[PDB]
Amino acid sequence: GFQTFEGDLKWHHHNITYWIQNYSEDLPRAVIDDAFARAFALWSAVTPLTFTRVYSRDADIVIQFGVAEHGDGYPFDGKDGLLAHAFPPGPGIQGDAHFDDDELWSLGKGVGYSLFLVAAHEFGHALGLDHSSVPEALMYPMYRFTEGPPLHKDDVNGIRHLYG
Numbered sequence: 001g002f003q004t005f006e007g008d009l010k011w012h013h014h015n016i017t018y019w020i021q022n023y024s025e026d027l028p029r030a031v032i033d034d035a036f037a038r039a040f041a042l043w044s045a046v047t048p049l050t051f052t053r054v055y056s057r058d059a060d061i062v063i064q065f066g067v068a069e070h071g072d073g074y075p076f077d078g079k080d081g082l083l084a085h086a087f088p089p090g091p092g093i094q095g096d097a098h099f100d101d102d103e104l105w106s107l108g109k110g111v112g113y114s115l116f117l118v119a120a121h122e123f124g125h126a127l128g129l130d131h132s133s134v135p136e137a138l139m140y141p142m143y144r145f146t147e148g149p150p151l152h153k154d155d156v157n158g159i160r161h162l163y164g
C-alpha cells in the first residue's frame with residue numbers, strides 16, 4: 001500500500017512549526033487557519049509529532065496559496081487539474097505545502113474543493129508519505145469529498161513506518 005520518498009525522508013525533530021505565509025480570499029482567515037489546524041490535528045494524533053503555528057519564514061512547513069508560476073518551478077494550471085502540491089521533509093522548500101488559488105476553496109460538499117481534506121493529503125507528503133496504491137487511503141491520489149474520518153489503516157501504517 002503506502003509509499004515513502006527515496007531514502008525515507010522524514011523530520012528529525014518532534015516539534016514541527018508551520019507558517020501560513022498568505023491567504024486565499026475564498027474563506028475568512030480564521031476559517032483557513034482552522035482548516036489547516038484540523039489537517040495537522042489528524043497527523044499529530046497518530047505520530048509523536050506536534051504542530052505549532054508560528055510567524056516566521058524559518059518555519060518547517062511553509063504554506064502558500066499561489067497561481068500559475070509561484071516561485072518553485074512547478075507551476076499551477078488554473079481551475080481544476082493540479083490542486084496543490086507539497087515537498088517531502090527536509091530544509092528550505094522541503095516540507096512546504098502550496099495550494100492553487102485558481103481553485104475555489106470551500107469547507108462544504110461539492111462546491112469546489114475542501115481545503116481541510118486537500119491539506120490533510122498534502123501534509124501527509126510534507127511528513128514523508130508518497131502516494132499509496134490502496135484505494136480509499138488518504139494518500140491514494142484522487143479527490144473525493146467525504147464527511148467520514150479521512151485516515152485509513154494504510155496511512156497510519158505508513159506514518160508509523162516513518163515515525164514509530
Ligand SMILES: Cc1cc(C#N)ccc1N1CCN(S(=O)(=O)N2CSC[C@@H]2C(=O)NO)CC1
Pocket residue numbers: 081082083084085086117118121122125138139140141142143144146150
Ligand atoms: C488524494 C486526496 C485525498 C483527499 C482526501 N480526503 C483530498 C485531496 C487529495 N488530493 C489532493 C492532491 N491531488 S492533485 O492535485 O490532483 N494531485 C495528483 S498528482 C499531483 C497532485 C498531488 O498529489 N499533490 O499532492 C489529488 C487528490
Ligand SMILES: [Ca+2]
Pocket residue numbers: 059060061062090091092093094095096
Ligand atoms: Ca520547509
Ligand SMILES: [Ca+2]
Pocket residue numbers: 076077078079080081082083100102103
Ligand atoms: Ca489547478
Ligand SMILES: [Ca+2]
Pocket residue numbers: 024026100101102103104105
Ligand atoms: Ca480561489
Ligand SMILES: [Zn+2]
Pocket residue numbers: 066070072074085098
Ligand atoms: Zn509550489
Ligand SMILES: [Zn+2]
Pocket residue numbers: 121122125131141
Ligand atoms: Zn499527493
